Design a protein around this nucleic acid. Structure first.
Lengths: 76, 100
DNA sequence: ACTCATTGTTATGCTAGTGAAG
DNA sequence: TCTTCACTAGCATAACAATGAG
């Protein structure tokens, strides 16, 4: 089953949280994720740019690969 | 002329529109915003979603189709411009650093 | 097999607002 | 003016991407 493509945050967050867990284990991902949203908010456009371009490339490749994808949630 | 052929052409167009917006890296919200800016009429993310889902009045689909065509033209122009400019900067910086 | 956080992109339930025909 | 009926563009907000320990 095809999973929905990841945004720019998700890309950067994925990068960070691996190093952060290597660095300091027995830290739960809840503290981790609060920390990373906090951090990401503080970056400039300049800083964000490669992750933005990366997520663009990912969405492009996802559509290219699965042409007939449609995001189908399960609403409450 | 008939609703069958028109809906067929429109549904294929909607697919093509999505294709292009993805390959150009615009979010749905982005397309709305830019359409807003270059035709002076705001368009919500919602209506764009509805468009790409062929969940709009045939009239509305065909009402927006010209606007999207002009948008796609302008978008693609900007892409080509940026692409050429970027590679230009590349060649420039390269040669410069090299000789220096 | 969950819940847990986070940002950002998408789908859509849910309007308050707008007429048409009785 | 008030009542249903049916659409309607937009406003909200939840769903789901990654990750893996509780």
């Amino acid at each position: 089953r095809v999973k929905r493509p990841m945004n720019a945050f998700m890309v950067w967050s994925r990068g960070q949280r691996r190093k952060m867990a290597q660095e300091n284990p027995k830290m739960h991902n809840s503290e981790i994720s609060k920390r990373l949203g906090a951090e990401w908010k503080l970056l400039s456009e300049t800083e964000k740019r490669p992750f933005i371009d990366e997520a663009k490339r990912l969405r492009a490749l996802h559509m290219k690969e699965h042409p007939d994808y449609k995001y189908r949630p399960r609403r409450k | 002329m008939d609703m069958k052929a028109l809906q067929k052409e429109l549904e294929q167009f909607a697919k093509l529109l999505k294709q292009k917006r993805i390959t150009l890296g615009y979010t749905q919200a982005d397309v709305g915003l830019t359409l807003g800016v270059l035709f002076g009429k705001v368009f919500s993310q919602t209506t764009i979603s509805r468009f790409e889902a062929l969940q709009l009045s045939l009239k509305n689909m065909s009402k927006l189709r010209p606007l999207l065509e002009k948008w796609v033209e302008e978008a693609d122009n900007n892409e080509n411009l940026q692409e050429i400019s970027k590679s230009e900067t590349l060649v420039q910086a390269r040669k410069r650093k090299r000789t220096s």
